[PDB]
Write a protein that holds these residues in place. Structure first.
Motif, PDB file in Angstrom:
ATOM      1  N   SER A 185       0.683  -1.265   0.235  1.00 63.06           N
ATOM      2  CA  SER A 185       0.153   0.104  -0.265  1.00 63.06           C
ATOM      3  C   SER A 185       0.816   1.242  -0.015  1.00 63.06           C
ATOM      4  N   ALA A 186       0.326   2.513  -0.555  1.00 62.86           N
ATOM      5  CA  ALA A 186       1.302   3.446  -0.888  1.00 62.86           C
ATOM      6  C   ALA A 186       0.411   4.870  -0.779  1.00 62.86           C
ATOM      7  N   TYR A 187       1.078   5.915   0.000  1.00 60.34           N
ATOM      8  CA  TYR A 187       0.344   6.831  -0.579  1.00 60.34           C
ATOM      9  C   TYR A 187       0.104   8.220  -1.506  1.00 60.34           C
ATOM     10  N   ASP A 188      -0.739   7.956  -2.232  1.00 63.53           N
ATOM     11  CA  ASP A 188      -0.787   9.049  -3.615  1.00 63.53           C
ATOM     12  C   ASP A 188      -0.802  10.815  -3.452  1.00 63.53           C
ATOM     13  N   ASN A 189       0.366  10.982  -3.565  1.00 65.33           N
ATOM     14  CA  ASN A 189      -0.175  12.890  -3.268  1.00 65.33           C
ATOM     15  C   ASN A 189      -0.692  13.854  -4.438  1.00 65.33           C
ATOM     16  N   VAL A 190      -1.468  12.786  -5.014  1.00 65.95           N
ATOM     17  CA  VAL A 190      -2.237  13.286  -6.550  1.00 65.95           C
ATOM     18  C   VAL A 190      -3.576  13.054  -5.952  1.00 65.95           C
ATOM     19  N   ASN A 191      -4.284  12.189  -5.979  1.00 65.43           N
ATOM     20  CA  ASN A 191      -5.954  11.813  -5.611  1.00 65.43           C
ATOM     21  C   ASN A 191      -5.145  11.552  -4.063  1.00 65.43           C
ATOM     22  N   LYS A 192      -4.576  11.620  -3.336  1.00 67.48           N
ATOM     23  CA  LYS A 192      -5.030  12.271  -1.475  1.00 67.48           C
ATOM     24  C   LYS A 192      -5.736  10.735  -1.542  1.00 67.48           C
ATOM     25  N   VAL A 193      -5.310   9.402  -1.682  1.00 68.30           N
ATOM     26  CA  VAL A 193      -5.709   8.634  -0.543  1.00 68.30           C
ATOM     27  C   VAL A 193      -4.373   7.339  -0.960  1.00 68.30           C
ATOM     28  N   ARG A 194      -4.556   6.537  -0.037  1.00 69.31           N
ATOM     29  CA  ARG A 194      -3.424   5.435   0.036  1.00 69.31           C
ATOM     30  C   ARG A 194      -4.161   4.288  -1.738  1.00 69.31           C
ATOM     31  N   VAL A 195      -2.627   3.113  -2.395  1.00 71.44           N
ATOM     32  CA  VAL A 195      -3.391   2.489  -2.913  1.00 71.44           C
ATOM     33  C   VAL A 195      -2.574   2.039  -2.886  1.00 71.44           C
ATOM     34  N   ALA A 196      -3.009   0.551  -4.166  1.00 74.00           N
ATOM     35  CA  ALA A 196      -2.083  -0.764  -4.094  1.00 74.00           C
ATOM     36  C   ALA A 196      -1.378  -0.267  -4.541  1.00 74.00           C
ATOM     37  N   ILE A 197       0.072  -1.234  -5.043  1.00 78.45           N
ATOM     38  CA  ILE A 197       0.843  -1.445  -5.418  1.00 78.45           C
ATOM     39  C   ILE A 197       2.067  -2.644  -6.289  1.00 78.45           C
ATOM     40  N   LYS A 198       1.732  -2.981  -7.080  1.00 77.99           N
ATOM     41  CA  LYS A 198       1.452  -4.694  -7.501  1.00 77.99           C
ATOM     42  C   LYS A 198       3.203  -4.246  -8.603  1.00 77.99           C
ATOM     43  N   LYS A 199       3.861  -4.287  -7.698  1.00 80.82           N
ATOM     44  CA  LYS A 199       5.747  -4.755  -8.248  1.00 80.82           C
ATOM     45  C   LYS A 199       5.275  -5.855  -9.167  1.00 80.82           C
ATOM     46  N   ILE A 200       5.462  -6.117  -9.934  1.00 77.02           N
ATOM     47  CA  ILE A 200       6.647  -7.521 -10.727  1.00 77.02           C
ATOM     48  C   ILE A 200       7.121  -7.681 -11.326  1.00 77.02           C
ATOM     49  N   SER A 201       8.379  -8.741 -11.290  1.00 75.40           N
ATOM     50  CA  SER A 201       9.598  -8.642 -12.295  1.00 75.40           C
ATOM     51  C   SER A 201       9.820 -10.160 -12.951  1.00 75.40           C
ATOM     52  N   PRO A 202       9.460 -10.240 -13.795  1.00 77.59           N
ATOM     53  CA  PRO A 202       9.410 -10.667 -14.465  1.00 77.59           C
ATOM     54  C   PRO A 202       9.937 -11.439 -15.139  1.00 77.59           C
ATOM     55  N   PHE A 203      11.138 -10.408 -16.181  1.00 77.50           N
ATOM     56  CA  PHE A 203      11.235 -10.523 -17.535  1.00 77.50           C
ATOM     57  C   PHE A 203      12.550 -12.070 -17.769  1.00 77.50           C
ATOM     58  N   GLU A 204      13.189 -12.305 -17.145  1.00 83.66           N
ATOM     59  CA  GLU A 204      14.137 -13.918 -16.985  1.00 83.66           C
ATOM     60  C   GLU A 204      13.017 -14.755 -17.436  1.00 83.66           C
ATOM     61  N   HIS A 205      11.487 -14.412 -17.049  1.00 77.99           N
ATOM     62  CA  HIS A 205      10.832 -15.876 -17.609  1.00 77.99           C
ATOM     63  C   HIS A 205      10.120 -15.709 -18.464  1.00 77.99           C
ATOM     64  N   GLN A 206      10.391 -16.195 -19.617  1.00 73.41           N
ATOM     65  CA  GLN A 206       8.519 -16.427 -21.281  1.00 73.41           C
ATOM     66  C   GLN A 206       7.109 -16.309 -20.941  1.00 73.41           C
ATOM     67  N   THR A 207       7.411 -17.333 -19.497  1.00 66.97           N
ATOM     68  CA  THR A 207       5.842 -17.194 -19.430  1.00 66.97           C
ATOM     69  C   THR A 207       5.758 -15.886 -18.214  1.00 66.97           C
ATOM     70  N   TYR A 208       6.627 -15.450 -17.405  1.00 67.44           N
ATOM     71  CA  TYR A 208       5.824 -14.228 -16.506  1.00 67.44           C
ATOM     72  C   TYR A 208       5.684 -13.394 -17.427  1.00 67.44           C
ATOM     73  N   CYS A 209       6.115 -13.420 -18.688  1.00 67.33           N
ATOM     74  CA  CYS A 209       6.759 -12.217 -19.369  1.00 67.33           C
ATOM     75  C   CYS A 209       4.967 -12.353 -20.372  1.00 67.33           C
ATOM     76  N   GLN A 210       4.419 -13.442 -20.557  1.00 69.53           N
ATOM     77  CA  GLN A 210       3.448 -13.865 -21.378  1.00 69.53           C
ATOM     78  C   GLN A 210       2.408 -13.497 -19.802  1.00 69.53           C
ATOM     79  N   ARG A 211       2.259 -14.164 -18.694  1.00 71.41           N
ATOM     80  CA  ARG A 211       1.092 -13.534 -18.423  1.00 71.41           C
ATOM     81  C   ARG A 211       0.476 -11.701 -17.683  1.00 71.41           C
ATOM     82  N   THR A 212       2.138 -11.308 -17.724  1.00 68.30           N
ATOM     83  CA  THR A 212       2.244 -10.021 -17.079  1.00 68.30           C
ATOM     84  C   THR A 212       1.328  -8.848 -18.304  1.00 68.30           C
ATOM     85  N   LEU A 213       1.827  -9.417 -19.480  1.00 66.63           N
ATOM     86  CA  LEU A 213       0.818  -8.685 -20.597  1.00 66.63           C
ATOM     87  C   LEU A 213       0.081  -9.210 -20.750  1.00 66.63           C
TER      88      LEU A 213
END
Ligand SMILES: O=C1c2cc(-c3ccnc(NC4CCOCC4)n3)cn2CCCN1[C@H](CO)c1cccc(Cl)c1
Length: 330
Positions: free
Chosen positions: A33-61
């Protein structure tokens, strides 16, 4: 100042997003979770690190294109995407989503649900699933931790990382070889709401089958008349008879209409399993069913490219292009 760090993971999402806290994780990333200083609410931020695996890349796209096309109250969306300004630098992708308060997994660990609340949650799961399926998309990983809830019992389905055009919630077909696999999962979730425990908690593949058979009873011949893995078939035929356990014995104080629907969702044979519109129209959901207020998708979702055939590098390029519209000065 600097880039923020959470449990060993860099989260390069400033300056718009700050004050980060861990709220979840996946196979190749983490959610804060994180504070968005534009919309002035907390949001969820999903970090994805997929690029080592083709399957992960497919899913992410797939996840990105699906969610950016979908628009529905019971489905998590994407509000923003952050990634490096050059493709050579892009090692991570940050998907920004509405922040939900909790999930059904946690709720069921701590709370007894009234019949009305079970009914209302089940209705929202199915209403969202009706939209998904109307776009000819499968979620494929419905389970309580992917059903998010806010303070007012609004429900949203998340994690479309496995969407296409978890063992306990896995349909028998999957293990013995379609939209029916999501219906099975929703059945498992209904049963779990009824008793606060998973109905089929197998420790492994074979054990999963034994748990299902332990309730449904030995499959009939029609149940076995299909394409089926030879090993699985031979294994099931090696087992002794199992009696069917009546739903009202497993769930002694459950609403009988709820159990009738459960029976139709947890049907062994996928071709005999109830479909989402029929489920919404079931008497158990009468008090919420409202086909006037249950959007479907304008058209079936389709990909222009065969993602399965593309190399990692080409997929990374596509991800870079898909995410370009969220860059400044685009
Ligand atoms: O996609 C989500 C996700 C996102 C969220 C989400 C989104 C918005 N709000 C809230 N609120 C919280 C508040 C505290 O209680 C729990 C709910 N959660 C939940 N999930 C479900 C679990 C995490 N993953 C997936 C795996 O399944 C994933 C994440 C990262 C990398 C990868 Cl590879 C996969």
């Amino acid at each position: 100042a600097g880039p923020e760090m959470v449990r060993g993971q860099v989260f390069d999402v400033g300056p718009r997003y700050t004050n980060l806290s861990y709220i979840g994780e996946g196979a190749y990333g983490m959610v804060c979770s994180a504070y968005d200083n534009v919309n002035k609410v907390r949001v969820a931020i999903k970090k994805i690190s997929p690029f080592e695996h083709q399957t992960y890349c497919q899913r992410t796209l797939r996840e990105i294109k699906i969610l950016l096309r979908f628009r529905h109250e019971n489905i998590i969306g994407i509000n923003d995407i952050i990634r490096a300004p050059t493709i050579e630098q892009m090692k991570d992708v940050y998907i920004v989503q509405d922040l939900m308060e909790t999930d059904l997994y946690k709720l069921l660990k701590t709370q007894h649900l009234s019949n009305d609340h079970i009914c209302y949650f089940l209705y929202q799961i199915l209403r969202g699933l009706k939209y998904i399926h109307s776009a000819n998309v499968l979620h494929r990983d419905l389970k309580p931790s992917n059903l998010l809830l806010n303070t007012t019992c609004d429900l949203k389905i998340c994690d479309f990382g496995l969407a296409r055009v978890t063992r306990w919630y896995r349909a028998p077909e999957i293990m013995l070889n379609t939209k029916s696999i999501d219906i099975w999962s929703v059945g498992c979730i209904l049963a779990e709401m009824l008793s606060n425990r998973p109905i089929f908690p197998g420790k492994h593949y074979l054990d999963q089958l034994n748990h299902i058979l332990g309730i449904l009873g030995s499959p009939s011949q029609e149940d076995l008349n299909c394409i089926i893995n030879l090993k699985a078939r031979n294994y099931l035929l090696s087992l002794p008879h199992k009696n069917k356990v009546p739903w009202n014995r497993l769930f002694p104080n459950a609403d009988s209409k709820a159990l009738d629907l459960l029976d139709k969702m947890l049907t062994f044979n996928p071709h005999k399993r109830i479909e989402v519109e029929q489920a919404l129209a079931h008497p158990y959901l009468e008090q919420y069913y409202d086909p006037s207020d249950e959007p479907i998708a304008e058209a079936p979702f389709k990909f222009d490219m065969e993602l399965d055939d593309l190399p990692k590098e080409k997929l990374k390029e596509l991800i870079f292009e898909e995410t370009a519209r969220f860059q400044p000065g685009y």
